Amino acid sequence: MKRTFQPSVLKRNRSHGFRARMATKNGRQVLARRRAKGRARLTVSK
Amino acid sequence: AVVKCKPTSPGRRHVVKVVNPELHKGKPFAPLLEKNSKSGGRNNNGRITTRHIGGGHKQAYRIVDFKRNKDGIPAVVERLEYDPNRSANIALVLYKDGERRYILAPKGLKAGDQIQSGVDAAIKPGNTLPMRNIPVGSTVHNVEMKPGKGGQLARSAGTYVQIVARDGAYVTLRLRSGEMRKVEADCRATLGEVGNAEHMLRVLGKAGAARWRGVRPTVRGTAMNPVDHPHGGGEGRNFGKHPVTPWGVQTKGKKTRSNKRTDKFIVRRRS
RNA sequence: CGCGGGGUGGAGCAGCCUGGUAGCUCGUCGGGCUCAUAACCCGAAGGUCGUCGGUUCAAAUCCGGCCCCCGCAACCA
RNA sequence: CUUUAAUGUUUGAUGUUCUAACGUUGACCCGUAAUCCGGGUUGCGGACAGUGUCUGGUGGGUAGUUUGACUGGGGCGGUC
RNA sequence: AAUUCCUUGUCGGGUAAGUUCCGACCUGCACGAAUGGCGUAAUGAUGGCCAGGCUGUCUCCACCCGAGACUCAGUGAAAUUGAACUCGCUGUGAAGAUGCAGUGUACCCGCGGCAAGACGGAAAGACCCCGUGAACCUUUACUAUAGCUUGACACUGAACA
RNA sequence: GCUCGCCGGAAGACCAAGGGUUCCUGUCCAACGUUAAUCGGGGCAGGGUGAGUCGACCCCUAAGGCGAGGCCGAAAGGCGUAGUCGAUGGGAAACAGGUUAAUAUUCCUGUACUUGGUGUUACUGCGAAGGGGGGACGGAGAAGGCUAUGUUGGCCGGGCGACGGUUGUCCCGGUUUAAGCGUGUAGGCUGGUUUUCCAGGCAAAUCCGGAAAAUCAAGGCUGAGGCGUGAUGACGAGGCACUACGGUGCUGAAGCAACAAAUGCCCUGCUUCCAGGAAAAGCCUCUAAGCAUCAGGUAACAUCAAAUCGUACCCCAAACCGACACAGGUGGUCAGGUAGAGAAUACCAAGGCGCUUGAGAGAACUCGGGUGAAGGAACUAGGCAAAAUGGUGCCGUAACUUCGGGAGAAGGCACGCUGAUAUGUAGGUGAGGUCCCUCGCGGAUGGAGCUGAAAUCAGUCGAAGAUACCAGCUGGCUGCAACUGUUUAUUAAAAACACAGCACUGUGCAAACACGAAAGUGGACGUAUACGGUGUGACGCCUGCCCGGUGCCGGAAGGUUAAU
RNA sequence: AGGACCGAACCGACUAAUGUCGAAAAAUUAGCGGAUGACUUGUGGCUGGGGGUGAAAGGCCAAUCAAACCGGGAGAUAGCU
RNA sequence: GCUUGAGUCUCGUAGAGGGGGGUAGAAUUCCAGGUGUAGCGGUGAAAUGCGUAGAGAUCUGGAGGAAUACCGGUGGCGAAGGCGGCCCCCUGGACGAAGACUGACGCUCAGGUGCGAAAGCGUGGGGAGCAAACAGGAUUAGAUACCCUGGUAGUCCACGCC
């Protein structure tokens, strides 16, 4: 069974990256809430 | 030509391939070829705008000159090439001043003959000139719609448009559907119909013969579900409806000619 | 069990709905036409209105019971 | 009052012609090495087309809902 | 007959025996000609029927070989559970009783077994019905609506006939 | 440590992906491991990743994304031009041995190579966002010639062997060698060169292209392997020497021939068919704008520079993904001995393991298997499951048919080993010798050696000779669907769907239609022999009657009829 | 040449059995079907919730689908338990 | 070997002989516009159909398809079937004239092969008129016949089949 999560570093950052979020207004709405909870891990990055 | 393949296998016993032993088996001209990526129904928005299109084989785009603007230059035909993007074959042509260009090949066009454009050319299938210097009743093709565009009508295999009459700056044409259309007389045409007339006789045979071609399987509405198609429904092939398209507009009898800006050019509708 | 429809000259069918008077075709009897039959033309008779009661001035007719016949329903587990 | 004849006038329904509005997913040149676009000559149509507003018709493509109850279980029939 | 309710209709063939199968008869409840009809070689992890070959599937199981089951040592769960000094029968009863009544019987307590019961355990029944519940879908249910289409007004003007 | 057993086209050795110190070492055993544990991927401490040639970054580009202006849209935002990113693509350059507790085409030893800066010298015209060439390509099939690699032989070293033989047709072990450079083969491709002119390539061109001529018959280009060299070098069986008894130092013979042979290489070839098979840049080359005693270009030589980042270990699994040290899934390369068609399979080499609960009993019963008298589907919903058939060559093969098939139909015969034909044949390869030559990696000629089917006859062992693994059940009737193909991932794989074909109808291109408030795209850089919709669904014989109800289309006169 | 045949790797999942608090939240075992094509597969993108996709089952869209998940309307409403 | 067999060569004649490619007018149907009015069409009689939305009729223009009045004749050609408006190109056969030439090359012919009207069939176009099937209206005892109003396949063409 090919479990529903075949890992890929490159694809992760092309769809969940930091700068990937800074693209649209909706993305900046994400980090708004992320910093709202004072979460140390803003987004999956390196 | 027409050659029935021997019934050696299920899927081959109905294949009739067109044999045209005049096509150059060599490699097509490099400078006259550029790429044309596939999209298969997808568009700007990425939706499947048009169904049953995709997959298929890879094919490089050919530059066919419809304008043929060069005047007073004889053209020695080089060879007949095969064309994926068009049902009509293309003839590699060499001008007198040494330029290689492609043209849609008429009926009697062999490897090496001559053609010429402008209003100095007489009547030989392949000659190009405005229809205000043409004999009334000539069989032509690659006729254009606007003075200088290049060509829009009569381009497929075995297609020919018969010039009915000529009144001033308007030529009474007869398109292939038989729909009389008055086009501006300042439009360039090409004598002689397109050959390759055995194209109709070609019968694929295999479903794969359509798959590598570029088509995609069409599913009937009588099998689908009401949520996906207006026909569907029922446990046992029920119909009871007026056959309509996947988008509600009625078919099998529904005229959709609403142009208004070109109504003046249609003498009689196609019949 | 329940719903709807029908039963009218010898046969096949109108008429009923909006109650008093019954029609068409065929068929039968009789005549003519022909050597003769059929066909055709002409003339006429023939209907307990399935069955009984009730209501009404009056019942094929309106209603109900009964009999026969036709179609539908005779179900979901 | 009816039938009517000419003129002045008043809007309206068509026909054809015309070019400035406008359309131009025609050609050419330039911005510009750029099949986008904008503009300038020219060509082709033409007061249409297309669009805004109001309105008749169509419309299960789509949306929101309705689709009675009693009933020797409900349904059917029947009934209120 | 993928269709025939009645019906396993009737005749003939295959079996000693045939509600199936095969070929015909037409009384087709309710086949039928692109919501295609009748045939059709080949193909088919397709359906039904039959024969040969070969076998434990069967008459009826018998034995042997390995891993568990079993014993010892180490580690060590789970479903479930009001409380139990937790017997059979006859009757009674929210109507099929281990517990009430009557009577009979039975030393206390383990392990391996087997599953008739404890209407055993698991899923606040999927069946039926209800709620002036929801959700999708249908159309000649009601009212609206995108789209399409019609005419007028405006962008939109000059002329004569 | 000694035996046994297991995988071995993997349960092996390494990379990409993806984890992130799990790698190595010492120490410790509470917690972690379904058991103990001085063991360990557990805790604690220390060490380890060394690059101009590997990869990435970088030069360039596709699908596609963002997108100066701009078009459009309540706003957000959407789209798109020039550009700019984005590889799974293309583009410069290193191989061998040794060395560590762990890393090495990275360090060391030896031997080569690439791209630029700068300087000097001898010469010469150079020169873009522009042109041309090149880059640059499909599938399948067949074939020649080699290599990886392996066996045998020769030679070299050792032994002659605890039970009968073994100094000989005996046994075991080794017999390894690259990048580059030079010559430039098998084989493949293309006719070279010189002169003139030109509406052609946005401009221009000496580059390309076309069109006329002359001379001669070759030249040029591409190209595995071999042969030399690289190397009187390294490695090297086995000894010689010290043992912390793990290993280290030193020394060291042979190192060739032949045959067989890849899916690797030539091949990014050739033939053939069709469904007709990226782009750009590096490179090469030509000019414009211009600069010219220059700057620069070409060639040689010297020197300098080649940065940044990853580099440990696992990588078909106890380290990724499945909550677990989980019988699952994971792309790619190399891939030997024997039989065998084969990467199947059985047994083995290299290499890596015995799967982290065992000791007894051998009960019923349960799971995986073997065998079974007589009979043979009598079982049952049903021949479900097992059983049996199963290879190659040859003999031979029906109804029907679209004349391809059906078909490997069905049904049978011979298969071991040895000898003889023949001190192992046909066939294949091919040294030496001989001759010639436009002289080399040449061609005829010649045939040793080596390798090696199969057929025929005879003899002989056994019940059985495709003796194991492996390896079709077949025939007859017939429904349905043509067929290969597709689907309910996780109860339905079929007659359901798709299918080429046929039919109707829509559409004259700013086409219909679809997405989208719009712009703009798809359709299609296609255009009626085209495209969209629907229905049926190979082929063959055919496809009747109805225009009432409903829908569509045509004609609009009249009645009715909103806005104004 | 072939949507050709037999048959590994490979892809899929028809039959039977084991398993069902399993070794595993669909696998193993012994047989199967395709296996040069309508093929399989890696890397990298595009299409998105009344929308996407679909050789069309109302199957698939992170083990969940006749309408995904998450937050907020919302302590929605419940004549019912 | 010689010719009275047959065949060939030199010159002309008539001809719907065949194939391919163009061309013309009359006539019919269809469409649009102008003039114009209640019938038109049809038969043995009648009716369906067509028409007051204005047909038919008449005139003008245009697009189509097939067949070719008169000449035309028991005339001509060809093996037969069959073939006729005109023209061009390619081309077969028969006949007559006066001679020459080869020297029996002749005749027929199971099997075999080829041609072959119409109807019919397939693939692809064309579609005016005519008209199976079918439909309506009459006639009729019945009329799925004869009559009339329409009308698909076919009839035409290129390539094959029978």
Curated annotation (Swiss-Prot), chain A:
GO terms for biological process: translation. NCBIfam families: rpmH_bact (TIGR01030). Belongs to the bacterial ribosomal protein bL34 family. It comes from the Bacteria. The gene is rpmH. PROSITE patterns: RIBOSOMAL_L34. It comes from Escherichia coli O45:K1 (strain S88 / ExPEC). Pfam families: Ribosomal_L34. Coiled coil: none annotated. Transmembrane segments: none annotated. This is Large ribosomal subunit protein bL34. One of its GO terms (cellular component) is ribosome. One of its GO terms (molecular function) is structural constituent of ribosome. HAMAP family: Ribosomal_bL34. Signal peptide: none annotated.
Curated annotation (Swiss-Prot), chain B:
Keywords: Acetylation, Ribonucleoprotein, Ribosomal protein, RNA-binding, rRNA-binding. The keyword Coiled coil does not apply. SMART domains: Ribosomal_L2 (SM01383), Ribosomal_L2_C (SM01382). Part of the 50S ribosomal subunit. Forms a bridge to the 30S subunit in the 70S ribosome, contacting the 16S rRNA. Interacts weakly with S6 in one of the 3.5 A resolved structures. In pull-down experiments interacts with CedA. PANTHER family: LARGE RIBOSOMAL SUBUNIT PROTEIN UL2M (PTHR13691:SF5), RIBOSOMAL PROTEIN L2 (PTHR13691). Belongs to the universal ribosomal protein uL2 family. This is Large ribosomal subunit protein uL2. The gene is rplB.
